[PDB]
Design a binder for this molecule. Structure first.
Ligand SMILES: CCCCCCCCCCCCCCCCCC(=O)OC[C@H](COP(=O)([O-])OCC(O)COP(=O)([O-])OC[C@@H](COC(=O)CCCCCCCCCCCCCCCCC)OC(=O)CCCCCCCCCCCCCCCCC)OC(=O)CCCCCCCCCCCCCCCCC
Ligand SMILES: CCCCCCCCCCCCCCCCCC(=O)OC[C@H](COP(=O)([O-])OCC(O)COP(=O)([O-])OC[C@@H](COC(=O)CCCCCCCCCCCCCCCCC)OC(=O)CCCCCCCCCCCCCCCCC)OC(=O)CCCCCCCCCCCCCCCCC
Ligand SMILES: CCCCCCCCCCCCCCCCCC(=O)OC[C@H](COP(=O)([O-])OCC[N+](C)(C)C)OC(=O)CCCCCCCCCCCCCCCCC
Ligand SMILES: CCCCCCCCCCCCCCCCCC(=O)OC[C@H](COP(=O)(O)OCCN)OC(=O)CCCCCCCCCCCCCCCCC
Ligand SMILES: CCCCCCCCCCCCCCCCCC(=O)OC[C@H](COP(=O)(O)OCCN)OC(=O)CCCCCCCCCCCCCCCCC
Ligand SMILES: CCCCCCCCCCCCCCCCCC(=O)OC[C@H](COP(=O)(O)OCCN)OC(=O)CCCCCCCCCCCCCCCCC
Ligand SMILES: CCCCCCCCCCCCO[C@@H]1O[C@H](CO)[C@@H](O[C@H]2O[C@H](CO)[C@@H](O)[C@H](O)[C@H]2O)[C@H](O)[C@H]1O
Ligand SMILES: CCCCCCCCCCCCO[C@@H]1O[C@H](CO)[C@@H](O[C@H]2O[C@H](CO)[C@@H](O)[C@H](O)[C@H]2O)[C@H](O)[C@H]1O
Ligand SMILES: CCCCCCCCCCCCO[C@@H]1O[C@H](CO)[C@@H](O[C@H]2O[C@H](CO)[C@@H](O)[C@H](O)[C@H]2O)[C@H](O)[C@H]1O
Ligand SMILES: CCCCCCCCCCCCO[C@@H]1O[C@H](CO)[C@@H](O[C@H]2O[C@H](CO)[C@@H](O)[C@H](O)[C@H]2O)[C@H](O)[C@H]1O
Ligand SMILES: CCCCCCCCCCCCO[C@@H]1O[C@H](CO)[C@@H](O[C@H]2O[C@H](CO)[C@@H](O)[C@H](O)[C@H]2O)[C@H](O)[C@H]1O
Ligand SMILES: CCCCCCCCCCCCO[C@@H]1O[C@H](CO)[C@@H](O[C@H]2O[C@H](CO)[C@@H](O)[C@H](O)[C@H]2O)[C@H](O)[C@H]1O
Lengths: 318, 172, 115, 114, 345, 83, 69, 98
């Protein structure tokens, strides 16, 4: 029964990822006065399956300068970690109930950068090395504030448990008291997922394809599957932290339906943002995070230590 | 499951052997990441939680900086792996064989001393407060804010002074 | 057991896709195909030569700032203390000195990348 | 190098309070008020004596007191109490705040009846 | 360095040893040693040339390695006894690695090889801190556990340091290397007596420090880095010739100077404990130090080496140094043997 | 103090993020000192019973200790119930 | 037209509700018709283990009321 | 506990042996120091858990804090070495023999 539950998490999440590739291409198309896919299946709903089958039927690259162990490992690690991020998510009940589920997310997400670093290094080509070193800079930029932003929010939660966030927001979205942190959190998740305007580790106008430039066929598909799975994950996380879906102990599915709607909306704004802005320069992302977010994040952390003490609003331990 | 923690501490030992052989720092950095993960599992296995997750998170950040520094300042045309040099490979294999030998012999002479292969799993958790509530490791670490503030004063000073130190070292 | 089970399945699924991707397709290996890419011309050197890091000082500052947040992550347990004034002063002092450290590095041009 | 003295299995026989945690939690507030004197005697023995073998007599009075408390619920308030602990047992944390309706019905019963 | 950096770094250099000397917990003692290593590195490398970079790097890797071994001992003792201080019941191997690692931090032979190289690569005023202020914290730890230490390892470290400090200083033409070997020899004496009488360890440390501080100030006056440079003193600052000569003879332990007292008292105490053979060997090889100090006295005050024409322009200039701390330490390091009973008990 | 007002006004227009950071930092320090509810935060942490309240042996000289949990002696929590 | 984007969105939306709903139902099926018990602290684990021991069938979720005493 | 602490001490000894037996890269040695730190962190953490010593859990965190400062200084020094010589090889750091 636990194995059936693994299937009813992984398989729907992988289908949701596949169709986000379709939704992105149609939303971007319509914002560009185009249609996007509308031939391969009705309204393009078989286009993801065609791209998947094409890639896995394609010859995978075995470049000569490549260090092959890390070359294979990196895309394998990418999809593993992307899927693993979902197991503690409470929708409203998680597959794996973790006491420190938020810290699990940070550690797992932080290991995810090494798939980019090792693939770019292992490929042993100049454009892939450029992409890897941009990932180093990207993590230094946003990881400095992402955990402090989370810290301040969880001083109203009272724990690192994701399921507790549901109870914390029983009467109100955490957006309302924490909207300045929610704004900074939202920009951080864009950078954390290497999404536009911070799509720098791939950045195709500059590095051709950056970290994955030497990758073909099915190994290339794993990086793509991992990226689209993470976009859904980070927005679902944003939904549970700041937009507390309505919870009733006798109507759990109401939470799931409301969660999906808000998560779908937050994923749409990711595609909307990509269609709207130019790219940052990767030194400018570092200055955005370290000279704007970090001062305010530190001040707000101090404010959110101060708040529960002077309002006598310390949340319960349990 | 009675071999679980011994297997982990055995994996940790191999990771440090790999690091000690000092291949290219790229693979050294990877070796510490795996050892850090294995070390996190051991802390978890003994009832830890916060400490295990901290050390992995800290070492994930630490090795990312080392990766960046390696590509700029510690790289050669042909970075060495564990297999590249027959001499390093032999001492990797010999080191693993000497681990099996050392554990095997010590098991024979004492049987319950340092190695107790008969009793693995019987002496992991000693006492546990069965009906307790406030017991997790994060509570202990948090005493820096209340009962062990001197520990936090010195820790905070070293990070603060570290900023002034590294700025001085690095200016031309 | 459950967390081990699902992560192994995650590893198992990823490795199966890799095996399919490497054994299903028709191959055709020859030297020009597998040479490193560089926009149609040959590379003039190894990609393994030193690549200068202009943000190296920010990078090692990040090492210290990452241990600062490690000192902050017990705060959810620390706010449960009876010694609220002590905890609050320690947290306020910790955040303020980290801000002063950032402020100093900022005014020393330590966040500017080298040229 | 002395022999550790252990009570016999026969000395350790008692009438078990073998009801589930939701049953205990549902009754826990009235139980604490009704069986306090016996319960506080046993806990004072344990903390003063630091030896579970020295407190077996008081431990058995704890079990008898708990069974006399639950037999009063059974004879007078069985149905209000069953409706309450069954609702409380649904929650993954067995939270009081999800069954205030059933708690009030049980509380009113043990007030009028007992 | 701007003033804010100087204040923070110098404060941390001062703070580390104060933490070590005041700490009950062995972990806080280790923290104190950590502050010392971190804070002194930017001062070592401040001038930024290849030699100072080499000196700071060699200092860092030695000191950090020794710090890990010390931490291992503290952690092993915490595992054994559930406490954060060494006891009578602490495993002897744990105590022997503490002694090994602290002696490597101090530069005692045979863990000495780094110290003459680092001293040579840094400015004189930093050599002064390295050989005086930086000795106090590791010694302070050792003094706390003096009943627990193994007399065999100590005497072997001690005699080795005296032997190599002696032979080491005999080959030097660089002043910074001569002081480093003088440090190693005197540390050998400090350590030999620690397990018997730690008060005499402190007596030797104090007399060594007030001899070494004014010797470094005398080198600093004209920046004399070599024998040939210091041999020009007769033309540049002849007034210093009397006090340098007496400080050198005092460092060598010649009576009736104050520096005879530490060697005299340590021999007395070693022989109260029947440590006759080591005391004889120590005292005999300490004469080799007096040889290379004498050769130094020969080239400064007892003969006049050739001078150069540009030195006349120096005689037209006025100096503002030394400060009056030089005269105080110079006099008290040479002329206080009559007050010996007030210094030992 | 007209020179600072022009300074603060320019900083608000040109460096609003830093102005907000310093203002929030200053407010966080000030608010606990002037708030009437600051005293309760410690009192609430003190009223949470994570440990069993071990009874005391009655020696006949404890007029202040309740003999039962529903005695009118001992610490009341009415302040928190109506907080 | 923009509303032709919706077929992909509906498929996405259905796929994102299944995990939450399926986990909630599978928990009740495998925990005696109740929510799966959460043991954040050792006290909660102790209660589950006691529930398992008194159940008669080695299942914590099979509850025993006053009919058992 | 018995066998785990033996393996952890062996892991420290190997990391120290790595530190003491240089190859060419200074960075490879800096990684060995981080290995000793990691071993000592787990040993301290496991000891505190096994003895239920909650008042000692600050200490493992302080071990990592100062190790981060040690590692930051080590990397800062390595930048200086690389600037002088264009590599991090330790054989170049030999000017102070004379
Ligand atoms: C994934 C499975 C491996 C698939 C690799 C592959 O594609 O086939 C290449 C290979 C086929 O031969 P090949 O393609 O001609 O080899 C050329 C490779 O570039 C040559 O391979 P390389 O350049 O990637 O270097 C191989 C090297 C690099 O591989 C690794 O070490 C990374 C994985 C280690 C984990 O591995 C080793 O040196 C032996 C590793 C021994 C295990 C490490 C134990 C010590 C470290 C302990 C910490 C654990 C981490 O198999
Ligand atoms: C049992 C051991 C279990 C494994 C434990 C390993 C522990 C971590 C290893 C760290 C070693 C390391 O990094 O050093 C790098 C160090 C420097 O490496 P490198 O700078 O890259 O180039 C020099 C190498 O020889 C590479 O350049 P090469 O290729 O020109 O070397 C030439 C020569 C090198 O000769 C050797 O094979 C040295 C090893 C002698 C056998 C020692 C047996 C173990 C005792 O190779 C041979 O032709 C002889 C092969 C037959 C030997 C049997 O390399 C070595 O000297 C050998 C490293 C492996 C020895 C590990 C044994 C450690 C035990 C302590 C030995 C010292 C005791 C002294 C007091 C008694
Ligand atoms: C490792 C096996 C991984 C299986 C993943 C699914 C892919 C299945 C189809 C490919 C089967 C390849 C194979 O084993 O062929 C036999 C292999 C030949 O492999 P191959 O080189 O012909 O693989 C290519 C397969 N086609 C022709 C479809 C492109 O022959 C042997 O017996 C060697 C053992
Ligand atoms: C390829 C590499 C893939 C690695 C994937 C990385 C995933 C992120 C890192 C995971 C480490 C943190 C795991 C964790 O914290 O879970 C702890 C969990 C107990 O959870 P807890 O909340 O403490 O509840 C117990 C009390 N009720 O503990 C448990 O339930 C079981 C023991 C935890 C260990 C599981 C470790 C993950 C599986 C690794 C598989 C091997 C990978 C190689
Ligand atoms: C992808 C799939 C496409 C999205 C599917 C949902 C589309 C739903 C379309 C219907 C939305 C109806 C909203 C009312 C619009 C008409 C209106 O009354 O205007 C309201 C307001 C402007 O009002 P008006 O008075 O005309 O202007 C002057 C006011 N100062 O204007 C408003 O502020 C209303 C804002 C409406 C926002 C919802 C519609 C956008 C949904 C896409 C979100 C982004 C997707 C990425
Ligand atoms: C404190 O650190 O003293 C150390 C040491 C005395 O040893 P100990 O007893 O172990 O220390 C514990 C309490 N002092 O104290 C000592 O070793 C004494 C150090 C003396 C250094 C001598 C330098 C010459 C200075 C001579 C002038 C001092 C006054 C001379 C006597 C004046 C009386 C007329
Ligand atoms: C890098 C990976 C390294 C792998 C290291 C090796 C892993 C395997 C561990 C083997 C060590 C002994 O492993 C196992 O220990 C348990 C105790 O838990 C012993 O326990 C069992 O057998 C022994 C007697 O033979 C008795 O204790 C008893 O009958 C039973 O408990 C097993 O017989 C032994 O096989
Ligand atoms: C030169 C640089 C140094 C100066 C800068 C540092 C100033 C000192 C600031 C840290 C102050 C620590 O202050 C110290 O706090 C601890 C708790 O942590 C108090 O400790 C008190 O409460 C604890 C709680 O467990 C009791 O166990 C203990 O017996 C009792 O003394 C000390 O009584 C107080 O002296
Ligand atoms: C105990 C030892 C047992 C005996 C071992 C014998 C091993 C001999 C292996 C022969 C090679 C098989 O390996 C496979 O060969 C094919 C064609 O031969 C090549 O495969 C690919 O490259 C060549 C390039 O022209 C194409 O012609 C071929 O159609 C394509 O599939 C690769 O080289 C390899 O994928
Ligand atoms: C150089 C670094 C500078 C940055 C660091 C500055 C730190 C200074 C902090 C000043 C603010 C202290 O704010 C202080 O908060 C505490 C509680 O926390 C309040 O304390 C009040 O509530 C507490 C409960 O918490 C009661 O027990 C107490 O009797 C009452 O005074 C004080 O009334 C207020 O003065
Ligand atoms: C050395 C021990 C004795 C001194 C004790 C320490 C206190 C010293 C107090 C005086 C320090 C003031 O020193 C001052 O520092 C600031 C740091 O903001 C430096 O100034 C820095 O920020 C300002 C911003 O306007 C600019 O000058 C520039 O961006 C940067 O240099 C000044 O160039 C220096 O003059
Ligand atoms: C137990 C007995 C104690 C004995 C005390 C020892 C006294 C000091 C002995 C060392 C002598 C100092 O060394 C002596 O210094 C004086 C200056 O002071 C020099 O004096 C001479 O040369 C200098 C220039 O060099 C002239 O400026 C000076 O006027 C002239 O007299 C001597 O040429 C030198 O030999």
């Amino acid at each position: 029964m636990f194995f059936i539950n693994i299937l009813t998490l992984l398989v729907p999440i992988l289908i949701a990822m596949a169709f986000l590739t379709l939704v992105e291409r149609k939303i971007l198309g319509y914002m560009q006065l185009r249609k996007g896919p509308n031939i391969v299946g009705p309204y393009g709903i078989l286009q993801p399956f065609a791209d998947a089958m094409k890639l896995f039927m394609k010859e995978p690259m075995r470049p000569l300068t490549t260090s092959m162990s890390l070359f294979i490992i990196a895309p394998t690690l990418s999809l593993t970690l992307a899927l693993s991020l979902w197991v503690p998510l409470p929708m409203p009940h998680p597959l794996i109930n973790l006491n420190l589920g938020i810290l699990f997310i940070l550690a797992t997400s932080s290991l995810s950068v090494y798939s980019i670093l090792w693939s770019g290094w292992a490929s042993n080509s100049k454009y892939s090395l450029f992409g890897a070193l941009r990932a180093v800079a990207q993590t230094i930029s946003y990881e400095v504030t992402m955990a402090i932003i989370l810290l301040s929010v969880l001083l109203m939660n009272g724990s690192y448990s994701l399921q507790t966030l549901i109870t914390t927001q029983e009467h109100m979205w955490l957006l309302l008291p924490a909207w300045p942190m929610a704004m900074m959190w939202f920009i951080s998740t864009l950078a954390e997922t290497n999404r536009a305007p911070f799509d720098l580790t791939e950045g195709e106008s500059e590095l051709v394809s950056g970290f994955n430039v030497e990758y073909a066929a099915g190994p290339f598909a794993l990086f793509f599957m991992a990226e689209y799975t993470n976009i859904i994950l980070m927005n679902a996380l944003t939904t549970i932290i700041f937009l507390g879906p309505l919870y009733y102990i006798n109507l759990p599915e109401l939470y799931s339906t409301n969660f999906m709607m808000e998560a779908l909306l937050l994923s749409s704004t990711f595609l909307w943002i990509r269609a709207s802005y130019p790219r940052f320069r990767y030194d400018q992302l570092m200055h955005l995070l370290w000279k704007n977010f970090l001062p305010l994040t530190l001040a707000l952390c101090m404010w959110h230590i101060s708040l529960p003490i002077f309002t006598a609003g310390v949340p319960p331990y349990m | 499951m009675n071999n679980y923690i011994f297997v982990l501490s055995s994996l940790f030992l191999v990771g440090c052997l790999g690091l000690a052989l000092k291949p290219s720092p790229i693979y050294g950095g990877l070796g510490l990441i795996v050892s850090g993960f294995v070390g996190c599992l051991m802390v978890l296995g003994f009832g830890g939680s916060f400490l295990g997750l901290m050390v992995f998170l800290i070492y994930l950040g630490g090795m990312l900086v080392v990766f960046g520094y390696t590509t700029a300042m510690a790289t050669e045309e042909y970075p060495e792996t564990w297999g590249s040099n027959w001499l390093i490979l032999g001492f990797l294999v010999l080191g693993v064989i000497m681990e099996v030998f050392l554990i095997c012999v010590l098991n024979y002479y004492d049987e319950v001393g340092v190695i107790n292969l008969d009793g693995l799993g019987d002496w992991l958790m000693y006492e546990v407060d069965d009906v307790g509530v406030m017991l997790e490791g994060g509570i202990g670490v948090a005493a820096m804010y209340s009962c062990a503030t001197w520990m936090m004063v010195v820790a905070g000073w070293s990070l603060f002074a570290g900023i002034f130190i590294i700025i001085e070292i690095t200016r031309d | 057991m459950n967390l081990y089970t699902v992560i192994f399945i995650n590893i198992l699924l990823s490795l199966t896709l890799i095996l399919v991707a490497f054994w299903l397709p028709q191959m055709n290996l020859y030297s020009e195909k597998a040479n490193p890419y560089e926009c149609g011309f040959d590379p003039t050197s190894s990609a393994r030569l030193p690549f200068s890091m202009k943000f190296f000082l920010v990078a090692i500052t990040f090492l210290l700032f990452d241990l600062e947040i490690a000192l902050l992550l017990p705060l959810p347990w620390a706010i449960q203390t009876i010694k609220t004034s002590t905890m609050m002063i320690m947290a306020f002092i910790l955040v303020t000195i980290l801000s002063l450290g950032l402020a100093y590095e900022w005014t020393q041009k330590g966040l500017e990348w080298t040229e | 190098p002395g022999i550790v003295e252990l009570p016999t299995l026969e000395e350790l026989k008692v009438e078990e309070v073998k009801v589930s945690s939701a049953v205990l939690k549902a009754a826990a507030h009235h139980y604490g008020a009704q069986c306090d004197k016996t319960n506080k005697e046993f806990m004072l023995c344990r903390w003063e004596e630091k030896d579970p073998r020295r407190c077996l007599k008081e431990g058995k009075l704890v079990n008898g007191c708990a069974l006399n408390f639950f037999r009063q619920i059974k004879s007078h308030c069985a149905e209000p109490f069953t409706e309450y602990w069954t609702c409380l047992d649904y929650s993954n944390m067995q939270l009081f705040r999800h069954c205030r309706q059933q708690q009030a019905k049980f509380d009113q019963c043990v007030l009028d009846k007992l | 360095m701007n003033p804010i950096t100087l204040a923070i770094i110098y404060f941390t250099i001062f703070l580390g040893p104060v933490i070590t000397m005041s700490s009950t917990n062995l972990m806080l003692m280790w923290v104190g040693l950590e502050f010392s290593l971190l804070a002194i590195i930017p001062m070592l490398i401040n001038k930024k040339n290849p030699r100072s970079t080499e000196a700071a790097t060699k200092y860092f890797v030695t000191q950090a390695t020794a710090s890990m071994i010390i931490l291992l001992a503290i952690v092993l003792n915490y595992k054994q006894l559930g406490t954060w201080m060494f006891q009578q019941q602490t495993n002897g191997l744990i105590l022997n690695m503490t002694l090994m690692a602290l002696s490597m931090k101090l530069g005692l032979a045979p863990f000495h090889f780094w110290l003459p190289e680092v001293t040579q690569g840094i400015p004189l005023h930093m050599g002064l801190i390295l050989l005086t202020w930086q000795k106090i914290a590791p010694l302070s730890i050792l003094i706390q556990i003096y009943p627990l230490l193994n007399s065999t390892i100590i005497l072997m470290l001690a005699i080795t340091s005296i032997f190599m400090g002696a032979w080491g200083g005999l080959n030097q033409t660089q002043m910074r290397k001569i002081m480093a070997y003088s440090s190693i020899a005197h540390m050998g004496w400090m350590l030999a007596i620690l397990p018997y009488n730690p008060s005499l360890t402190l007596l030797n440390l104090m007399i060594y420090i007030i001899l070494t501080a004014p010797m470094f100030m005398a080198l600093m006056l004209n920046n004399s880095m070599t024998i040939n440079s210091i041999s020009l003193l007769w033309n540049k600052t002849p007034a210093m010739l009397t006090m340098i000569s007496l400080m050198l003879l005092s460092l060598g332990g010649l009576p009736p100077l104050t520096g005879f007292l530490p060697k005299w008292i340590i021999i007395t105490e070693l022989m109260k404990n029947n440590c006759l053979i080591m005391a004889t060997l120590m005292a005999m090889m300490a004469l080799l130090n007096l040889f290379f100090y004498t050769r130094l006295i020969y080239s400064t005050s007892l003969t006049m080496f050739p001078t150069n024409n540009n030195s006349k322009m120096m005689t037209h200039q006025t100096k503002t140094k030394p400060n009056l701390m030089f005269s105080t330490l110079a006099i008290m390091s040479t002329m206080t043997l009559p007050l010996a009973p007030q210094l030992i008990t | 103090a007209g020179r600072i007002s022009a300074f603060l006004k320019n900083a608000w227009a040109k460096e609003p993020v830093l102005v907000v950071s310093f203002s929030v930092w200053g407010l966080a320090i000030i608010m606990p000192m002037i708030s009437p509810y600051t005293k309760y935060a410690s009192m609430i942490n003190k009223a949470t019973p994570y440990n069993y309240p071990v009874p005391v042996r009655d020696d006949g000289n404890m007029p202040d200790v309740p003999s039962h949990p529903q005695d009118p002696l001992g610490p009341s929590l009415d302040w928190l119930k109506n907080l | 037209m923009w509303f032709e984007i919706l077929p992909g969105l509906a498929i996405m939306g259905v796929c994102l509700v299944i995990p939450g709903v399926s986990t909630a139902y599978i928990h009740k099926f495998t925990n005696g018709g109740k929510e799966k018990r959460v043991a954040r602290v050792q006290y909660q684990w102790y209660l589950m283990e006691r529930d398992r021991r008194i159940s008669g069938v080695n299942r914590y979720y099979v509850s025993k009321g006053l009919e058992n005493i | 506990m018995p066998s785990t602490f033996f393996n952890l001490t062996m892991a420290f000894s190997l990391s120290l042996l790595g530190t003491l037996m240089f190859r060419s890269h200074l960075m490879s040695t800096l990684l060995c120091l981080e290995g000793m730190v990691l071993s000592l962190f787990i040993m301290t953490s496991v000891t505190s858990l096994n003895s239920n010593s909650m008042s000692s859990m600050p200490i493992p965190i302080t071990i990592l804090v100062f190790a981060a400062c040690e590692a930051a200084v080590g990397l800062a020094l390595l930048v200086k070495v690389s600037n002088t010589y264009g590599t991090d090889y330790v054989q170049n750091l030999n000017l102070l023999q004379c």
